[PDB]
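Posted in: Structural Biology > Protein-Ligand Complexes

Title: Requesting predicted complex, magnesium ion in pocket

I'd be grateful if someone could produce the 3D structure tokens for the following input. Sequence and ligand are given below.
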Amino acid sequence: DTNIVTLTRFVMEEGRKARGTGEMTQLLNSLCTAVKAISTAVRKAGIAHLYGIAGSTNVTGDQVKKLDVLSNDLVINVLKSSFATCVLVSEEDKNAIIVEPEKRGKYVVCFDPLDGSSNIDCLVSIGTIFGIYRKNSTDEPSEKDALQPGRNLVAAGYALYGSATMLVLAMVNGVNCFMLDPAIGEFILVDRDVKIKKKGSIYSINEGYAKEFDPAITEYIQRKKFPPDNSAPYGARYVGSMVADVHRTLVYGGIFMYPANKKSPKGKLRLLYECNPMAYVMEKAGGLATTGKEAVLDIVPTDIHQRAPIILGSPEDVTELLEIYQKHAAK
Ligand SMILES: O=P(O)(O)OC[C@H]1O[C@](O)(CO)[C@@H](O)[C@@H]1O
Ligand SMILES: [Mg+2]
Ligand SMILES: [Mg+2]
Ligand SMILES: [Tl+]
Ligand SMILES: [Tl+]
Ligand SMILES: [Tl+]
Ligand SMILES: [Tl+]
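-- Reply #1 --
Done. Output follows.
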């Protein structure tokens, strides 16, 4: 009651014995501020007329919504002001953003300011995704500082604007969930050291793409619906917002899939600010995250807006699908 374990307190105490300049706390405190401001706009978006498009398109091809602009501006401004960052990569910006010398700190942040664009207008859960790297280079900060493999992440996670607003944060020792208290505008710890189940009973994929799926995905799905051992078939869930489907995978277990297909060699989701952050969360929770052929966190990106296939969740479910890919593997 009068001893609130806030996100700030947790990350300060975490980074205590480990020493540190304390800019990670600065960064996350700043991010939390933009997340609250996004949550409040979202929760009254119809009244504030924030539905509808902005009138523009993303890089490879994406219709930019009003809340994309708002959330993008908020995240960039708070990150800059935090004095903790030097390079920013956003889904909404064609090029990396370089922070001004005076406000530069040591971190590189890749983010999706608003994830779940197709679900905005129907009031389904949407979110914010981020991954944070330490700049390694010694030269002037540049776009290349963002082109690190996922395994180099120091922290990653997401905000979920669902039935409640939740900040899920993964760092080297594990995953923790903080719920926004709307009364005092603080993220409070509600789930400690989260670990995903070894095996789940939900599969999550858009079967609208059945016609384009590779034979391994096709086989796996058939197996969920017609188990060979007479076990009960898996239930299906696909909210359509990566943050919502991945969060459910984390807390209920199971598998989430956005694979490569006949029209999309690399899938749809973006490696730097969608796939890597979630793969990292999953791995810190004891889960797996693969493209079907390689670990997502091991990919070395060459494009900040690069796409990747992703299959993640409970280790025994992801493994079962890898076995099918392996079985189908060819010259
Ligand atoms: O409509 P589709 O192709 O299933 O795409 C849904 C995916 O697209 C995204 O909106 C990309 O931002 C994800 O949040 C989501 O998982
Ligand atoms: Mg977005
Ligand atoms: Mg997204
Ligand atoms: Tl977008
Ligand atoms: Tl969006
Ligand atoms: Tl995407
Ligand atoms: Tl995207």
